[PDB]
Amino acid sequence: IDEVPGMADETALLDWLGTMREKQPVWQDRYGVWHVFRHADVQTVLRDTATFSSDPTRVIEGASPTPGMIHEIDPPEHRALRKVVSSAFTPRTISDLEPRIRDVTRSLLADAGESFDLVDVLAFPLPVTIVAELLGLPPMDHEQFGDWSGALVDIQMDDPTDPALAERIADVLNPLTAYLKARCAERRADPGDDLISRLVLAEVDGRALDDEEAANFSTALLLAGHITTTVLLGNIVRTLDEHPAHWDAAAEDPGRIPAIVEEVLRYRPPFPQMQRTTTKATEVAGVPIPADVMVNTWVLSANRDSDAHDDPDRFDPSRKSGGAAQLSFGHGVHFCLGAPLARLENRVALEEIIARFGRLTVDRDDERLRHFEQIVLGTRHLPVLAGSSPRQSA
Ligand code: HEM
Ligand SMILES: Clc1ccccc1C(c1ccccc1)(c1ccccc1)n1ccnc1
Ligand SMILES: Clc1ccccc1C(c1ccccc1)(c1ccccc1)n1ccnc1
């Protein structure tokens, strides 16, 4: 009746979510937030944007959406802005990144010894380097860019109800946003082919982005790639380490890797929950929910729901997977804009791990392994051990 268990103890959280799907699939917590646990009900909510709005500022007095952020806005404005941003951040822009992601990955892994932190070595520097280059930032600016991004990632280790959270976020986000806004002005003066240049030049149905909107979107790209590569890649290695036969399977046929990625997403989604606000009195699975309250859709619970997935707690890459049905990227019109980049970056990273090492295991003699306590499902670091590498003279 009391409290939502924390992210850190994954077993207890998963156990609790099980009991809820079973006994209270639509639950109202002590703060008046409504949780939704079943795959079918989560889908219902995510599809009905008219009832379940993505704007959480509407019920907070003088707060308004962040300009250039598509995840806080509803149709029809949502469609119009995602059109503008996509015309810049295009499918071909992402896919063209493969050789460089591979190059950076291969270089970063070649200097890692045999015992190292997978996050410090790879999962943290790779996405920052890639986004920075995508954005067109001078190499000399990259370190500070990653410093700002890292500081924001570190904050997510902290309690979200800590009343200083908002202020701490502001002290890093402000200079980061200032920086990007100044780069947008620069590309406006002299546009090239980098993403910031495409952002300031983009226009769809007469809608163009100002430097504020362009910089905010660029900020979301940085933080999205950084946090998610850190979390998903760690989850990939942790999960494979629990089912180590797949390492050999993927070594013999690297074409098996995209399915592994999808199954790790299902099994250990970087974001276990998403939020909506009701716009009117409504119902989920016969349970009445009043107007103007927050609803939490538990992607984690839905992904483990036996009505949606056979033997839902079995790690099994052989499942049908892929595409728009990957609930870990959400569902419907807000389906992750970065899904192609996520899928690409983590596939290349896993290809390269296997290429050099054959496998990694989570280091047992090291608990630098601190789980994110809220928002994210995974760890800030992942101490690993390579049993084999090209460095062995045997
Ligand atoms: C494994 C990696 C990732 C996961 C698990 C993930 C997850 C998600 C989820 C669940 C949503 C939907 C939020 C909602 O419905 O309210 C979303 C939206 C979004 N994601 Fe990702 N994401 C990942 C990687 C990325 C990357 C690399 C980018 C870089 C652009 C990105 C950018 C975005 C953007 C801009 C939105 C808002 C889309 C919209 O509102 O139309 N994500 N993401
Ligand atoms: Cl964490 C989060 C969740 C949902 C929306 C925005 C953010 C965000 C943030 C803050 C700290 C660490 C990582 C991300 C954020 C998301 C994307 C880009 C920048 C910041 N944020 C919190 C307050 N304003 C913006
Ligand atoms: Cl970029 C970010 C940082 C920290 C937490 C969440 C996100 C973000 C998101 C927003 C709502 C629900 C789940 C995740 C996000 C926040 C603000 C703007 C864009 C994306 N995200 C990271 C990757 N894809 C989406």
Domain 1-394, classified CATH 1.10.630.10, yes or no:
yes
User: Cis omega (within 30 of 0) on the bond before 317?
Assistant: no
Q: Which two tokens stand for residue 246?
A: 């797949």
Q: What are phi and psi of 287, to 5 degrees?
A: -100, 120
Spans of all domains in the chain: 1-394
User: Which residue in this structure is represented by tokens 């896919």?
Assistant: 95
> Which value, in Å, is the radius of gyration of the alpha carbons in the chain?
21
> Is 72 annotated as a binding-site member?
yes
Resolution stated for this PDB structure, in Å: 1.9
Enumerate residues 6+ apart whose C-beta is below 8 A from 6.
13, 373, 374
CA of 254 to the centre of ligand 1 (A): 26
The structure's method of determination equals X-ray
What's the half-sphere exposure (Cβ side, CA atoms, 13 Å) at 135? 29
Q: Which of 266, 271, 288 is nearest to 376 (CA)?
A: 271
Q: Say how many Å lie between the CA of residue 205 and the centre of ligand 1.
A: 24
Q: Is 79 in the pocket of ligand 1 (CB under 6 A)?
A: no
Identify the DSSP state of 117.
E
Q: Give the DSSP per-residue string, 139-198.
A: GGGHHHHHHHHHHHHHHTTS-TT-TTHHHHHHHHHHHHHHHHHHHHHHHHHS--SSHHHH
How far apart (Å, rounded) are the C-alpha atoms in residues 121 and 115? 11
Question: Which structure tokens are listed for 91?
Answer: 């499918």
- Residue keyed to tokens 């986000």: 173
Please give the span between the terminal C-alpha atoms of the chain, in angstroms, as a whole number: 59
Alpha-carbon distance 302 to 295, whole Å? 15
CB 6: neighbour CB atoms within 10 A?
14
Largest CA distance in the chain: 69
**Which residue's CA lies nearest to atom 16 of ligand 2?**
220
Cα of 106 vs centre of ligand 3, distance in Å, is 27
If you search the block for the tokens 């890093």, which residue do you land on? Answer: 172
**What sign results for the dihedral spanned by CA atoms 207, 210, 216, 219?**
positive
**Measured distance CA(336)–CA(343) in Å, rounded:** 11
Joined together, the tokens standing for residue 392 give: 């062995």
Structure tokens at 108: 């970063």
Mutate to test the pocket of ligand 3, among 46, 271, 375 (most ligand atoms within 8 A of CB): 271
Do the annotations mark residue 334 as ligand-binding? yes
**Residue nearest to ligand 2 atom 17, measured at CA:** 220
How far is residue 374 from each of residues 85, 156, 306, measured CA to CA in Å? Answer: 29, 7, 25
CA–CA gap between residue 341 and residue 373 (Å, rounded): 26
Q: Cβ–Cβ contacts within 10 Å for residue 171, how many? A: 10
Burial 288-302 (b: 16+ CB within 10 A, else e): ebeeebbbbbbbbbb
Span from the CA of 285 to the centroid of ligand 1 (angstroms): 27
- Provide the β-strand partners of residue 273: 298
Alpha carbons 116 and 123: distance in angstroms, whole number:
12
CA 133, 135, 138, 143 dihedral sign is negative
Give the number of the ligand closest to the Cα of residue 219.
Answer: 2
Residue nearest to atom 18 of ligand 3 (CA): 220
The label of the residue with tokens 């946003």 reads 177
Are the C-beta atoms of 264 and 368 separated by less than 8 Å? no
Question: Which of helix, strand or coil describes residue 27?
Answer: strand
Q: Which residue has the tokens 């997977």?
A: 321
CA distances for 43 relative to 82, 196, 270, 326, 328, angstroms: 21, 34, 18, 12, 12
* Tokens describing residue 145: 């860019």
Nearest CA to ligand 3 atom 22: 224
Residue position matching structure tokens 């995508």:
134
Ligand 2 atom closest to the Cα of residue 219 is 18
Contact residues of ligand 3, CB 6 A cut-off: 69, 71, 220, 223-224, 227-228, 271, 274, 336, 338, 375
Mutate to test the pocket of ligand 1, among 53, 327, 336 (most ligand atoms within 8 A of CB): 336
Rounded Cα distance, 133 and 338, in Å: 16
The whole-angstrom separation of Cα 261 and Cα 341 is 13
Residue that is written with structure tokens 């959400």 in the block = 330
Instruction: Look up tokens 């009445």; give the residue.
Output: 288
Sign, CA torsion 244/302/296/336:
positive
Of residues 237, 235, 223, the one with CA closest to residue 153: 223
Residues in the chain: 394
Per DSSP (E only), the strands in the chain are: 26-28, 34-36, 52-53, 115-117, 203-204, 207-208, 273-278, 282-284, 287-289, 294-298, 361-362, 383-385
Cβ atoms of residues 345 and 258 within 8 Å: no
Q: List, as one string, the DSSP characters of 242-274.
A: HSTHHHHHHHH-GGGHHHHHHHHHHHS-S--EE
The answer to whether 187 is annotated as binding is: no
